[PDB]
Symmetry: C4
Subunit: 222 residues, 4 copies
């Protein structure tokens, strides 16, 4: 109740956005949730004024990202109220998803962790892509004839690929062949490998963040 200011306001606000999309809402509740949005919207309008008009920070600073979150929090929901006539106007209040990211740290840290690992992270992604395509290609050739409706194309087998490789596994597409299921099992295993490859990179990324502070204060110790 001391630090989470804007993030707390976003909580019922974004829940209210979700509440309006529920079918069979009574006129009372339909308006009550809309009124809830208005109050939360009106709360951010004070917040926008509190940042713009009050100008006691220092001499040299950068506030471009922070103001942008406050600006979009009041303009987009207002533009929806004015321009959009359909009930789908309240979906535009989703811009309040930027609000919890505003006053939270870690995101400047994640920025430089992802920056120091961008070279390696993009590499894992394209590896995932290459593996996905190949894994789908094999599953297509093996299965296309038995299941023309499920494995009839590379895209169709690609659906099975991302589902199986990421180890999500819905169950709507399953290889029926022995040769297919042996491939399937190998996709699942190599999935576990990719899981750990993301974890390996990021753990080395977060380590080198602390290592930067340890060699930063270590060189400062002299």
């Amino acid at each position: 109740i001391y630090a989470p200011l804007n993030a707390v306001l976003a909580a019922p606000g974004l829940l209210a956005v979700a509440a309006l999309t529920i079918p069979d809402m009574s006129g009372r509740s339909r308006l009550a949730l809309a009124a809830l949005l208005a109050v939360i919207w009106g709360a951010y309008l004070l917040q926008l004024a509190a940042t713009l008009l009050k100008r006691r920070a220092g001499v040299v600073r950068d506030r471009t990202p922070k103001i942008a979150i406050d600006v979009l929090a009041v303009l987009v929901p207002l533009a929806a109220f004015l321009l959009d006539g359909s009930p789908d106007w309240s979906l535009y209040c989703a811009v309040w998803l930027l609000k919890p990211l505003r006053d939270s740290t870690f995101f400047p840290v994640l920025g430089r962790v992802l920056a120091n690992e961008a070279r390696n992270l993009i590499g894992v992604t394209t590896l995932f892509g290459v593996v996905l395509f190949a894994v789908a290609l094999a599953a297509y050739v093996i299965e296309r004839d038995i299941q023309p409706e499920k494995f009839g194309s590379i895209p169709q087998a690609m659906w099975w690929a991302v589902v199986t490789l990421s180890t999500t596994g819905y169950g709507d597409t399953i290889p029926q062949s022995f040769a297919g299921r042996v491939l399937a099992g190998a996709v699942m295993m190599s999935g576990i490998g990719i899981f750990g490859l993301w974890a390996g990179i990021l753990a080395t990324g977060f380590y080198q963040e602390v290592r930067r502070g340890d060699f930063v204060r270590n060189w400062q110790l002299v």
Copy 2:
């Protein structure tokens, strides 16, 4: 040899205790078994009562040690199930014996270690959670807009799209809500890749947390080694 001999004493009693709770929830339990499982609970409740006195009657052991988390579990382990026995009349009373879940926790170590790992990395850990929540909603919002019309039974509301989103993003995928349209399936794929991304984030923070835990012992090792 050492980890399975030091901790399993006070914590051991919770195992048959918590299984006895789970046993009394099964329908068609014969009176013989019904009473025997209740009798088992009472014995373990009795066993924990002597454990309560052991921490209360013992006044001297060293100089200064904290026993607030240790005694609190010992108190709750005998207070709750007895209060439920007398105040609640329905057979649901023994569900309060689930308080013994705290018994194996602060009986061994690791958890005090886990505490300071979770404390020194709380900034990042809470940040990942809020990233999960934000990505969860945005993804669900998209899934709703894409597939509310085609297949109205699912994805017909943000809540329903959020139900799919958690199932998909956590890479759980029950398979009760699966997008039909190509546009929604590409999104679904993007959710599953970013799912592994979050898995790597949790594993990334905690790997750095437990690493600092050991290197914090070096600050105690550099001061006085031999």
Copy 3:
């Protein structure tokens, strides 16, 4: 795979062995194949009989050494499959040849390292395991009370919720049991979220465990060079 043909000689034989055990369980196998697969088992078992005699008879290798686990695997590999062959009349005898699952573990350099990594983390690893059990049960208890009346056959007891709990918490999730009410599904999401939390803990502990093995790899750096 080019240099690992004549390197794990004792482990390579286990591959066709274990796959034969799997083949003899497939229903409606032809009489010839049934006999041929059983013949393959006896040749591999025969091969281990030479392997046992090679390690038992020959003993001239150094002065100070310890090979208790290595002999333990080889002794079982010839005694157990033979005992079943003689004593078991049912076709299930060939299942006992799964003893050769220990054979790949015999010549691996990895498992000596994994053993001491698990030994260095035993305190933490059992801690994460009990944390899984506690969270499992607590979540099951919650899922039980919520879904009792709505879903009688699928959430009617704690064990039924426990089944859902491991299915959900480990993030397996077949789809056989799912909370139906809003209340239960909010919990469900939190169980899945804590799944990712537990996953990261196991990875965190073990990553620290293998990091400390590099710390242990300062024996040749501080003493030799």
Copy 4:
């Protein structure tokens, strides 16, 4: 911008999409031809790429460029062979050799090589552990579930199908143990899965960490 400057990786994207596009049933005659023409242009592009990497030798005195040559050679020859040999519509599937093209002119992969090489003994050991456990669990589930479910657990290879599905934590739902004894096993298999995930993650984390130790030795020299 910088990595997306060489067309090697960029041209592969619409190339591989074109391979996937032709597998789709009920396509328009226009697109069917158009997508093939796109593959021919991309093929000709890689031919020009092949010529540059074969004729230029002025850069440096003595080094190695074997993998890049191998990828450029395979990117033109494999499709060319399919152009000449394959008469069926399956000819365009051989353009999936351009899966080596994103890997070609990109870093991380020289790192991923030595990271796998540094933990080579460890990584295979996890895989063989996975196999042993996979079998042991499948053998167990077979004996417990074979009578009640002959269609699902009637043989070891059938239980092995479940074992990968379950242990890799994919878990479709086409095979689920019924008996209490079988279900307690199932839960225990799911648990041990989380540990194997962590093992892969642990090994690879230690692999990438040791590469950073070498980066400290590389910063010590230069």
